Amino acid sequence: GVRDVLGTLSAVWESGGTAGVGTVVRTFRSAPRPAGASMVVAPDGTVSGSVSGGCVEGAVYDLATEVVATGTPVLQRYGGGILDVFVEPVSQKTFPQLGAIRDDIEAQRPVAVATVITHPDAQWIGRRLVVHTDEVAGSLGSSRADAAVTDDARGLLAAGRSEVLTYGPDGQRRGEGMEVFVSSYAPRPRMLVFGAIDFAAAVAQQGAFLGYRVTVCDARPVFATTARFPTADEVVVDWPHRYLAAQAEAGAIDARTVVCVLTHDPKFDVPLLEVALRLPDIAYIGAMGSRRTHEDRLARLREAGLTEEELARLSSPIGLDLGGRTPEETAVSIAAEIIAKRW
Amino acid sequence: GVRDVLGTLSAVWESGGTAGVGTVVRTFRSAPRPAGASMVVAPDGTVSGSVSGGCVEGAVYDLATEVVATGTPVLQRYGGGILDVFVEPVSQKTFPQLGAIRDDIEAQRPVAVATVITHPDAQWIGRRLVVHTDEVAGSLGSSRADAAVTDDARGLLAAGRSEVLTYGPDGQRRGEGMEVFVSSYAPRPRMLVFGAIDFAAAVAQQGAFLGYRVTVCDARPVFATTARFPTADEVVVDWPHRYLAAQAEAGAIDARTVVCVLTHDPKFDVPLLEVALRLPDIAYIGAMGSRRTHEDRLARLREAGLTEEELARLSSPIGLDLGGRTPEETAVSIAAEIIAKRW
């Protein structure tokens, strides 16, 4: 979200200065910039970031300037496409937690910021909560408000999603009049590819293209090699099931994590799938195979003790069934399946 | 197919020498190399190309050596995965048309080679036909044989596909005992992207990834710029409908051609879709749009005179419906739709 311009925003913050920050909070009609996109105006008048495809930057720039002066935050609607921009003043006084959020982001700790952008009681506006998996700071001004937003915020966060939530003026689910924006900062989600066959390269590009960090992993050191996968974030040599087990235990995999089994060697894929099919959920567990391979794996897996409920979590054969033949088409059919299964 | 190693193969051919060429003709069980993959052994014993993931190169190498000596072509089956390899001797005497095929390939003229790989009458084997859209050279040894194979070959060729076809011993559709391999050399198919908005970049990478030549095209010279699309094969400034009309007229678009309309500006997309929806078929005509945009385009198009039959050829909104939101996910959903609609 503010990731692009955060360095600039921090420098203002640390230096005791006050920045005008505008955040796209809602988009309609395919407005150029997604929800969360930011624009920051430094004390000296410099602006980094973008909120629109230039279409309303001038307006927002002025709005940000005025906001710093009055110190009153403002939700503004512009309207190709309709944009909702929240403009707020940001400084050590107005936002004490910003330094720590900056550190969370660097340290890869998920964190979310929930800001009231609409409320019948003008004083509520601009109040915010900083949410972690395990803790929460600040107050909206009501336990019931704080309680609901915290829960919803953690959910979005776990999913890495940014969104506007609506409530009654005191936090009632389903009522109306209070809206809050939740801006989630989760680290890049990861894709784990087990089996360093040539085809992994193709899988890894689709992963990169979708914004996953791809780890490629294989027990055979000839296969699992930086040289053969120069674009993968990381190449590892291990027993796939030992690697996966360890990431689980270290909390290095979360619910957006995606796993591809590109091996049908019984020495590997069965221990692997025993670990993977039993993990409190993660987004996707796919296994590459023709229809023959897929039926023989399922058999082996049943014989290994997997239950139908566990087996259900498995996407096999891998990919949507688009009819593709070349490996590139299989790779796209996989990417398509990943997207589909999360929406 | 032989494209990788053709330079080497030609040099042998031109120099009066005889090469042993092995061609993967059929694969089973996800054998490493697709149908058409070649391996050529030069007179001096050098080998370029690959037929398997090293698994049977030694065997094939020897087979190719023996074949050159006896001058008798041989279909051989190996069997991870099962491979069918046709090994034949290639020289100016045994293959007079090879130079011209080499030139066709360079000049971008589609051409196909149909070779008998199985027949009850041993003399038939290795006989071949060279097929163009508009002509055919050589003989199988029977008008009925020649007639059937030519037709089927043109079809595959137009689709850029390589495959084994089966016949009765005299060309009877559906009989058995004679099989021929058709090895198609079509130029890269093309993807035409109309509308140089930022999102075109994402569309263009999926296109590249699938092996299309992507042309990006837009009337506005600020948008349609090498700088903004450095990976696109070609960037053009034109009225989309004038460009498309001209390619049709020059025979620069064929039935594997794919078209993406990324604009909903009425000044462009309507003339464009009038040209595109009326072209003797091409593979795909997609139009980007939300559901609102899509309904308004359809209306405009009806008002412009398009028929329901013509309108049917349109994929709108563009992409498979996977639920994606970011532009990368939309782009994959498009690629997925392209693959699906051709199989």
Side-chain angles (χ1 to χ4, degrees):
Chain A
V2 304
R3 270 180 266 241
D4 315 51
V5 296
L6 179 72
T8 327
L9 178 48
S10 310
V12 182
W13 195 85
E14 301 279 347
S15 74
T18 297
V21 183
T23 300
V24 183
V25 115
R26 240 197 246 107
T27 339
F28 296 103
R29 312 204 173 182
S30 186
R33 308 281 289 114
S38 292
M39 202 222 37
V40 17
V41 173
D44 52 298
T46 9
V47 52
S48 71
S50 160
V51 123
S52 58
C55 301
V56 296
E57 318 288 340
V60 192
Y61 178 96
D62 294 344
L63 181 54
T65 307
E66 193 191 328
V67 168
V68 189
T70 58
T72 303
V74 164
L75 189 58
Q76 243 308 314
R77 173 167 281 200
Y78 301 85
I82 322 216
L83 213 68
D84 283 331
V85 186
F86 192 62
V87 184
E88 73 193 339
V90 174
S91 77
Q92 290 166 214
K93 268 229 171 177
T94 63
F95 201 160
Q97 301 97 345
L98 186 21
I101 294 168
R102 192 253 334 271
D103 293 326
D104 294 307
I105 287 161
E106 265 146 66
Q108 314 288 299
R109 301 184 284 275
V111 59
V113 177
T115 322
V116 186
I117 67 176
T118 306
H119 201 273
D121 177 347
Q123 269 159 28
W124 272 56
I125 287 166
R127 293 193 191 166
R128 91 191 102 218
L129 236 47
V130 180
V131 178
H132 288 94
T133 305
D134 39 288
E135 91 170 277
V136 43
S139 173
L140 264 16
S142 128
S143 333
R144 192 193 175 161
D146 302 326
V149 169
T150 302
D151 273 60
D152 298 348
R154 297 209 174 101
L156 288 178
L157 179 59
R161 291 166 67 201
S162 296
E163 246 159 66
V164 173
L165 308 156
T166 298
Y167 299 97
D170 194 29
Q172 23 267 32
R173 288 274 189 0
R174 264 168 153 201
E176 199 213 343
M178 176 192 197
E179 46 202 9
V180 344
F181 183 62
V182 171
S183 153
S184 282
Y185 308 93
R188 213 169 282 277
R190 43 196 301 233
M191 147 153 129
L192 304 182
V193 167
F194 295 100
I197 48 176
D198 304 41
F199 176 62
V203 184
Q205 299 166 63
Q206 290 300 320
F209 183 90
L210 287 155
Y212 288 95
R213 265 216 298 123
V214 177
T215 307
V216 181
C217 179
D218 195 300
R220 303 157 308 165
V222 181
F223 293 94
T225 276
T226 310
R228 321 189 55 232
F229 306 100
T231 107
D233 305 46
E234 157 188 48
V235 179
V236 160
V237 173
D238 201 336
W239 280 81
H241 76 274
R242 267 187 81 189
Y243 187 73
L244 187 48
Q247 311 301 286
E249 266 134 24
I253 59 172
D254 69 14
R256 343 209 290 306
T257 296
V258 153
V259 171
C260 300
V261 189
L262 303 179
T263 177
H264 61 280
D265 181 341
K267 190 196 186 153
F268 302 121
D269 73 334
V270 162
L272 185 51
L273 291 168
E274 277 186 79
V275 172
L277 297 173
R278 295 188 164 121
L279 285 172
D281 296 47
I282 67 174
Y284 183 85
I285 298 158
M288 187 199 57
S290 68
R291 218 154 251 304
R292 190 186 99 273
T293 306
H294 155 77
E295 281 303 345
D296 171 74
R297 178 147 44 210
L298 286 189
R300 288 190 283 113
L301 285 172
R302 291 200 184 93
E303 297 154 5
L306 290 93
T307 63
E308 291 306 309
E309 205 207 68
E310 279 155 0
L311 248 21
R313 315 193 166 103
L314 181 65
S315 303
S316 185
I318 202 176
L320 290 184
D321 190 25
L322 284 11
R325 309 188 167 188
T326 74
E328 287 82 359
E329 289 171 272
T330 316
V332 156
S333 95
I334 292 167
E337 199 184 33
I338 286 150
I339 292 166
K341 215 212 150 190
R342 93 176 161 252
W343 314 103
Chain B
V2 304
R3 270 180 266 241
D4 315 51
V5 296
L6 179 72
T8 327
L9 178 48
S10 310
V12 182
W13 195 85
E14 301 279 347
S15 74
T18 297
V21 183
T23 300
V24 183
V25 115
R26 240 197 246 107
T27 339
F28 296 103
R29 312 204 173 182
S30 186
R33 308 281 289 114
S38 292
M39 202 222 37
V40 17
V41 173
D44 52 298
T46 9
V47 52
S48 71
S50 160
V51 123
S52 58
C55 301
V56 296
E57 318 288 340
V60 192
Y61 178 96
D62 294 344
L63 181 54
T65 307
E66 193 191 328
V67 168
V68 189
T70 58
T72 303
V74 164
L75 189 58
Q76 243 308 314
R77 173 167 281 200
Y78 301 85
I82 322 216
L83 213 68
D84 283 331
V85 186
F86 192 62
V87 184
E88 73 193 339
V90 174
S91 77
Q92 290 166 214
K93 268 229 171 177
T94 63
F95 201 160
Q97 301 97 345
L98 186 21
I101 294 168
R102 192 253 334 271
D103 293 326
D104 294 307
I105 287 161
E106 265 146 66
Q108 314 288 299
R109 301 184 284 275
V111 59
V113 177
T115 322
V116 186
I117 67 176
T118 306
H119 201 273
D121 177 347
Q123 269 159 28
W124 272 56
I125 287 166
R127 293 193 191 166
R128 91 191 102 218
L129 236 47
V130 180
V131 178
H132 288 94
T133 305
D134 39 288
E135 91 170 277
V136 43
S139 173
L140 264 16
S142 128
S143 333
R144 192 193 175 161
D146 302 326
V149 169
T150 302
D151 273 60
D152 298 348
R154 297 209 174 101
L156 288 178
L157 179 59
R161 291 166 67 201
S162 296
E163 246 159 66
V164 173
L165 308 156
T166 298
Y167 299 97
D170 194 29
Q172 23 267 32
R173 288 274 189 0
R174 264 168 153 201
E176 199 213 343
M178 176 192 197
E179 46 202 9
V180 344
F181 183 62
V182 171
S183 153
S184 282
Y185 308 93
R188 213 169 282 277
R190 43 196 301 233
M191 147 153 129
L192 304 182
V193 167
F194 295 100
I197 48 176
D198 304 41
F199 176 62
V203 184
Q205 299 166 63
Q206 290 300 320
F209 183 90
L210 287 155
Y212 288 95
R213 265 216 298 123
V214 177
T215 307
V216 181
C217 179
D218 195 300
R220 303 157 308 165
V222 181
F223 293 94
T225 276
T226 310
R228 321 189 55 232
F229 306 100
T231 107
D233 305 46
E234 157 188 48
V235 179
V236 160
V237 173
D238 201 336
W239 280 81
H241 76 274
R242 267 187 81 189
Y243 187 73
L244 187 48
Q247 311 301 286
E249 266 134 24
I253 59 172
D254 69 14
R256 343 209 290 306
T257 296
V258 153
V259 171
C260 300
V261 189
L262 303 179
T263 177
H264 61 280
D265 181 341
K267 190 196 186 153
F268 302 121
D269 73 334
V270 162
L272 185 51
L273 291 168
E274 277 186 79
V275 172
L277 297 173
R278 295 188 164 121
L279 285 172
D281 296 47
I282 67 174
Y284 183 85
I285 298 158
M288 187 199 57
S290 68
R291 218 154 251 304
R292 190 186 99 273
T293 306
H294 155 77
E295 281 303 345
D296 171 74
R297 178 147 44 210
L298 286 189
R300 288 190 283 113
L301 285 172
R302 291 200 184 93
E303 297 154 5
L306 290 93
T307 63
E308 291 306 309
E309 205 207 68
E310 279 155 0
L311 248 21
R313 315 193 166 103
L314 181 65
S315 303
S316 185
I318 202 176
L320 290 184
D321 190 25
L322 284 11
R325 309 188 167 188
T326 74
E328 287 82 359
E329 289 171 272
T330 316
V332 156
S333 95
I334 292 167
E337 199 184 33
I338 286 150
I339 292 166
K341 215 212 150 190
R342 93 176 161 252
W343 314 103

